[PDB]
């Protein structure tokens, strides 16, 4: 039923920038599935299956992304799918830089290191975060006009669909 999976964390993000992004995609007749952005405990196998069935994933990195072990395992799946070529991924950097993601800097990184302490999957996760930004994405920084960025993402999704 969906073409686009929107991968992210944060209730505030859901209610603000993502609400506008989802509205614009639906306005452009694009069907989307919204992530378990609050980690209520929606079954991981279903999320991963949703990701696999998608044509496009928007991986929206923000400061809250790395707090969730589940969100990080979704990224693993995103990366596996993109490597094999079964889906198209578009990284979105919401108020952070691609370098912050690839090098795990700042709050984004600190939260990752806190979450992944002692976890044997840590190295594979770092690699996913290092590599995904090698795909060309869209940056929303503190000085961006958000409506313009919504339009930018919608145009990219349409291009990827057609």
């Amino acid at each position: 039923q969906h073409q686009v999976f929107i991968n992210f964390r944060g209730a505030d993000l859901r209610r603000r920038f993502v609400s506008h992004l989802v509205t614009a995609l639906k306005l452009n007749n694009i069907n989307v599935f919204i992530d378990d952005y609050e980690d209520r405990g929606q079954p991981l196998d279903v999320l991963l299956k949703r990701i696999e069935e998608s044509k496009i994933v928007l991986a929206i990195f923000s400061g809250n992304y790395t707090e969730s072990v589940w969100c990080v395992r979704e990224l693993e799946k995103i990366k596996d799918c993109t490597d094999e070529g079964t889906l198209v991924a578009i990284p979105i950097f919401y108020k952070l830089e691609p370098s912050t993601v690839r090098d795990l800097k700042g709050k984004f990184g600190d939260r990752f290191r806190s979450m992944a302490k002692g976890d044997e999957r840590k190295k594979k996760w770092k690699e996913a975060f290092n590599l995904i930004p090698n795909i060309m994405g869209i940056i929303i920084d503190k000085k961006s006009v958000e409506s313009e960025k919504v339009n930018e993402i919608v145009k990219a999704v349409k291009t990827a669909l057609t």
Side-chain angles (χ1 to χ4, degrees):
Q1 292 103 356
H2 66 292
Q3 300 99 63
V4 179
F5 188 103
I6 309 185
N7 161 230
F8 74 103
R9 287 300 185 278
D12 281 329
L13 188 52
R14 168 63 181 94
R15 290 189 291 257
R16 300 181 72 160
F17 181 80
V18 173
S19 74
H20 301 113
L21 174 54
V22 172
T23 297
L25 290 165
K26 289 182 176 187
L27 190 54
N28 285 271
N29 305 295
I30 296 168
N31 305 125
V32 312
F33 185 96
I34 301 318
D35 213 342
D36 192 9
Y37 59 88
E38 285 187 298
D39 282 314
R40 311 292 294 282
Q42 300 304 148
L44 174 61
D45 284 342
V46 177
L47 290 176
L48 300 182
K49 183 51 168 293
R50 295 301 168 264
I51 284 169
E52 242 185 326
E53 295 160 348
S54 296
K55 306 302 292 185
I56 306 167
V57 182
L58 307 174
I60 308 179
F61 304 108
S62 69
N64 297 297
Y65 191 98
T66 45
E67 291 172 338
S68 174
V69 57
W70 305 280
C71 192
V72 174
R73 294 183 64 180
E74 292 179 88
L75 180 62
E76 285 192 82
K77 180 62 168 181
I78 301 300
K79 178 189 180 43
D80 286 339
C81 291
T82 293
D83 283 347
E84 293 175 29
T86 58
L87 73 72
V88 170
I90 307 177
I92 310 302
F93 307 93
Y94 189 80
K95 305 190 189 151
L96 42 70
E97 300 294 300
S99 68
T100 290
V101 178
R102 179 188 307 117
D103 291 342
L104 294 166
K105 306 166 65 184
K107 284 170 177 205
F108 187 88
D110 296 343
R111 281 164 186 166
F112 173 75
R113 283 178 287 275
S114 181
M115 180 275 296
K117 184 181 184 184
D119 198 309
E120 287 180 356
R121 295 163 289 190
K122 188 172 173 189
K123 265 168 275 187
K124 188 180 179 200
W125 290 342
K126 289 188 301 192
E127 185 172 41
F129 281 113
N130 196 258
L131 296 184
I132 291 292
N134 290 336
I135 297 160
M136 281 299 289
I138 293 148
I139 299 164
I140 302 149
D141 56 44
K142 292 189 174 178
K143 293 186 284 178
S144 297
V145 181
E146 286 188 0
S147 65
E148 294 184 5
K149 290 295 163 177
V150 161
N151 295 342
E152 186 176 354
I153 293 166
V154 166
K155 172 175 172 46
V157 164
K158 288 182 170 201
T159 293
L161 284 176
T162 58

